[PDB]
Amino acid sequence: ASMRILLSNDDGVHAPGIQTLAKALREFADVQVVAPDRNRSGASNSLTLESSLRTFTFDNGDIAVQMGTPTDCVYLGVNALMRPRPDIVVSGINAGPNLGDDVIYSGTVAAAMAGRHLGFPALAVSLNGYQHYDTAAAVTCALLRGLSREPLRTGRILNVNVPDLPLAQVKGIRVTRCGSRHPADKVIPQEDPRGNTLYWIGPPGDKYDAGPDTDFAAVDEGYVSVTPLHVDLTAHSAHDVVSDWLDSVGVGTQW
Amino acid sequence: HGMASMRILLSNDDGVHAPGIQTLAKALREFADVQVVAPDRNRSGASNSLTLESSLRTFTFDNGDIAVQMGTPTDCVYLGVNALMRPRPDIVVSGINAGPNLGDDVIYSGTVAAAMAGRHLGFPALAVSLNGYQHYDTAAAVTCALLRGLSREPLRTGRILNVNVPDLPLAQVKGIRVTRCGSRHPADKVIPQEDPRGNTLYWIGPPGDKYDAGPDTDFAAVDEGYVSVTPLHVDLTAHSAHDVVSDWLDSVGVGTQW
Ligand SMILES: [Mg+2]
Numbered sequence: 232a233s234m235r236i237l238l239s240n241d242d243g244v245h246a247p248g249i250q251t252l253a254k255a256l257r258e259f260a261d262v263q264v265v266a267p268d269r270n271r272s273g274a275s276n277s278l279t280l281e282s283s284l285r286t287f288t289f290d291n292g293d294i295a296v297q298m299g300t301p302t303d304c305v306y307l308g309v310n311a312l313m314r315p316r317p318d319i320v321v322s323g324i325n326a327g328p329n330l331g332d333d334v335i336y337s338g339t340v341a342a343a344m345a346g347r348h349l350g351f352p353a354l355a356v357s358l359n360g361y362q363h364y365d366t367a368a369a370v371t372c373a374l375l376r377g378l379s380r381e382p383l384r385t386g387r388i389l390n391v392n393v394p395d396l397p398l399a400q401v402k403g404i405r406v407t408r409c410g411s412r413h414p415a416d417k418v419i420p421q422e423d424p425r426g427n428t429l430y431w432i433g434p435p436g437d438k439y440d441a442g443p444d445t446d447f448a449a450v451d452e453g454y455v456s457v458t459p460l461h462v463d464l465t466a467h468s469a470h471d472v473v474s475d476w477l478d479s480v481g482v483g484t485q486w
Numbered sequence: 487h488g489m490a491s492m493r494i495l496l497s498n499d500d501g502v503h504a505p506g507i508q509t510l511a512k513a514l515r516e517f518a519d520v521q522v523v524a525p526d527r528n529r530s531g532a533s534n535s536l537t538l539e540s541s542l543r544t545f546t547f548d549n550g551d552i553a554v555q556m557g558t559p560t561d562c563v564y565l566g567v568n569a570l571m572r573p574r575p576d577i578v579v580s581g582i583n584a585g586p587n588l589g590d591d592v593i594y595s596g597t598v599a600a601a602m603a604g605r606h607l608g609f610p611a612l613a614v615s616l617n618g619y620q621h622y623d624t625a626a627a628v629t630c631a632l633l634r635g636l637s638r639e640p641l642r643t644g645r646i647l648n649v650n651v652p653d654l655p656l657a658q659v660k661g662i663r664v665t666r667c668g669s670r671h672p673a674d675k676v677i678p679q680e681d682p683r684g685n686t687l688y689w690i691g692p693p694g695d696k697y698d699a700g701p702d703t704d705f706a707a708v709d710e711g712y713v714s715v716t717p718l719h720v721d722l723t724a725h726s727a728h729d730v731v732s733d734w735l736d737s738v739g740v741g742t743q744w
């Protein structure tokens with residue numbers, strides 16, 4: 232009768248986002264934290280395959296995985312560290328948005344995606360700023376109460392982006408689709424003291440597809456954005472064009 | 487016709503030293519202008535990860551190959567396209583990977599991620615994976631064929647092609663199928679291993695069993711000795727769930743007062 236939540240993030244176990252959320256969730260749910268030991272923004276859906284992973288348990292039960300990715304954390308949490316397995320994965324609250332085509336790089340999104348085969352759809356929660364963690368926590372709690380009110384029948388992952396506003400100013404929720412950007416192109420070089428050039432990944436590309444039905448627009452307008460995600464990367468609409476193309480260029484056929 | 491008619495950024499996730507990338511490099515160099523930009527070590531499992539908290543250093547080998555030190559496959563393509571290469575590449579080719587990248591494994595794949603990073607270029611990017619370790623020459627011939635195809639006629643729709651090659655002599659490959667990604671059961675094994683001081687450390691276990699591996703899937707194509715070609719995109723939206731999620735929110739009163 233009580234929800235059992237595996238809580239992770241990509242900011243790391245000590246981040247205000249995850250700690251604020253953990254506090255809110257523990258009011259009405261059982262919560263196990265399994266999270267990276269440090270900041271893994273940009274970890275996307277990476278997994279540690281070449282080495283075994285070391286865990287550390289804090290006094291309050293929180294588990295940190297040393298050099299663990301967000302996916303590593305959920306993998307260990309679901310398969311080894313929680314008995315019995317969790318009802319759900321919640322990942323967040325992230326410091327900063329996970330919108331549009333940025334989502335494939337997101338560690339926060341990835342931890343949620345790793346929980347896609349559990350009893351409840353996974354939640355990835357990101358704040359569009361750094362101030363109103365309480366607002367994002369309230370939205371998450373509402374969603375979780377929601378999921379115990381009626382089953383959500385389709386969608387294994389919800390990507391939630393919350394405006395960085397006091398709760399009273401959040402206008403509502405929009406169900407959205409992922410927008411997109413032009414390709415990022417600006418690298419930031421910086422010389423080391425020996426005059427060798429090192430390279431920083433620069434800013435994202437300008438918004439391309441950010442119209443009224445997108446996650447970008449919803450957040451800009453002061454709404455919580457909720458996008459259902461899946462892991463199928465197939466571009467189904469391209470099927471026939473590719474097939475005809477192959478025949479036309481004679482690849483895979485003699486004639 | 488043409489020893490260097492196409493400019494290729496060649497990357498992988500196994501790293502610059504991998505036989506799969508070196509075999510492919512030799513094959514591509516017969517007709518293309520090839521620049522290798524790849525990880526300095528095996529980054530299998532790197533998915534679409536990228537380095538944000540630190541700057542990246544490059545290392546150039548004697549043959550002109552570039553490794554990005556501690557670089558992920560996405561780092562390599564991002565840097566290769568945006569800073570390192572002149573002229574810029576016409577296309578990204580990622581591979582040949584030692585091992586399959588099929589079904590829902592693709593989102594965790596460093597090989598696929600490199601190709602995905604080149605999706606905005608003149609030609610659609612290729613990720614190329616061999617279903618095993620032996621017949622790199624087979625995967626190379628298949629890759630060369632696709633590239634020659636792209637120079638004969640441009641591909642209209644589809645920005646990334648995920649190519650899986652059966653580990654067979656070329657003569658035994660039956661043909662080519664355009665496929666969709668299948669999917670697996672979740673991996674569920676954790677392999678514990680005590681360190682010298684008695685601490686338990688954990689290894690990620692093997693992939694789950696195939697779940698969706700029917701006749702239209704990448705899994706089935708490879709299993710019956712065909713090259714699988716799946717067009718991929720980066721849009722993670724489950725568009726078919728939109729109405730269900732909307733109706734659901736309303737029915738549970740989340741986001742509305744009533
Ligand atoms: Mg983060």
Ligand SMILES: [Mg+2]
Pocket residue numbers: 499500529530531583584597
């Ligand atoms: Mg690999």
